[PDB]
Every structure is written in structure tokens, then in C-alpha cells.
């Protein structure tokens, strides 16, 4: 049994991945549509205009992971839907995927985070992380 936060992680890191990969294909098709491509061609960083690079490095992972865990379980759903329909509105692109992914995530984070802190602080007299321990701990199996 994994934590709800992990489920969110998978959901966002999965959407990001499928769209990152799909976006890479789209850009390739774009290049082949214009042709001129001999053997291969730079994505957008070797000789084109980079500025931002698509790379989910350890820190990038952590940034986003920290964001995902700060996301409400059921709020992930809309967040996902929004990302998909937004990306589709702007068309696939690995540069856009990454920038839009962090953009929306940070946007939704700023709002939702404020709600978290505001609600927990005001209801600090009703704090309760766990309910009770039960037989499930005796039969939780091993991973």
C-alpha cells in the first residue's frame, strides 16, 4: 500500500512523460514536414534557441515531487485534465510541455498551498493524521 501522494506522483510524472515523448514525436514530424533535415537535426538546444531545456534532472524531479505531494488527492484529477486540454490547445512541443507543466503546477500549487496552510493553521485544534491501528498492519505483506 503506497501513500496517496505517491499515486499523485505517478499520475503527474506519467502525464508529463507521455506528453514529453509524444511532444518529441510531434517536433520530429514538424521537422520532417519542412524537410531539409539531413540524417538528423537539433531539437532546440544545439544550435537553435534554447533558454529552457527539457530535462527532468534530480532537482527538477524534487521540485515537482514536492509540488505533487502538496497536491490534494482528488485535485490531481482536474490538474491532469487541465494540463492535457491546455497542451492540446497549444499543440505538443517538448519545450512547451516542460514550461507549461511547471507553469500550471506552480500556479495550482500557489493557490492550493495557500489553502493548505490556511486551513491547517485555523484548524490546528482538530489535527489528526491517523485514525487507529488495525489488523491490516499484521497482514500488510511485504513489497
What is the extent of the structural domain holding 8? 4-40+52-123
Residue with the three cell numbers 532546440: 44
Q: Which three cell numbers stand for residue 76?
A: 490531481
Q: Which three cell numbers stand for residue 121?
A: 493553521
CB atoms within 10 A of CB 34: 8
Distances (CA, A) of 104 to 12, 16, 76: 12, 12, 12
Through-space distance between the first and last CA atoms of the chain, rounded to whole angstroms: 8
Residue among 7, 26, 39 nearest 87 (CA): 26
Query: In whole angstroms, what is the distance from residue 68 CA to residue 8 CA?
Result: 6
**Method of elucidation:** NMR
Q: Is residue 82 part of a domain?
A: yes
Q: Is residue 134 part of a domain?
A: no
Q: Are 94 and 20 in contact (CB under 8 A)?
A: yes
Helix pair 58-69, 94-122: axis angle to 10 deg: 40
Strand ranges for the chain from DSSP E: none
Amino acid at each position: 500500500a503506497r501513500s496517496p501522494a505517491e499515486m499523485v506522483l505517478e499520475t503527474l510524472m506519467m502525464e508529463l512523460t507521455g506528453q514529453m515523448r509524444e511532444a518529441e514525436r510531434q517536433q520530429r514530424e514538424r521537422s520532417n514536414a519542412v524537410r531539409k533535415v539531413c540524417t538528423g537535426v537539433d531539437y532546440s538546444w544545439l544550435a537553435s534557441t534554447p533558454d529552457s531545456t527539457y530535462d527532468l534532472s534530480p532537482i527538477e524531479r524534487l521540485q515537482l515531487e514536492d509540488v505533487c505531494v502538496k497536491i490534494h488527492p482528488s485535485y490531481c484529477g482536474p490538474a491532469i485534465l487541465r494540463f492535457r486540454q491546455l497542451l492540446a490547445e497549444q499543440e505538443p512541443e517538448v519545450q512547451e510541455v516542460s514550461q507549461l507543466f511547471r507553469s500550471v503546477l506552480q500556479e495550482v500549487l500557489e493557490r492550493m498551498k495557500q489553502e493548505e496552510e490556511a486551513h491547517k493553521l485555523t484548524r490546528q485544534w482538530s489535527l489528526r493524521p491517523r485514525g487507529s491501528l488495525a489488523t491490516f498492519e499484521t497482514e500488510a505483506e511485504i513489497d
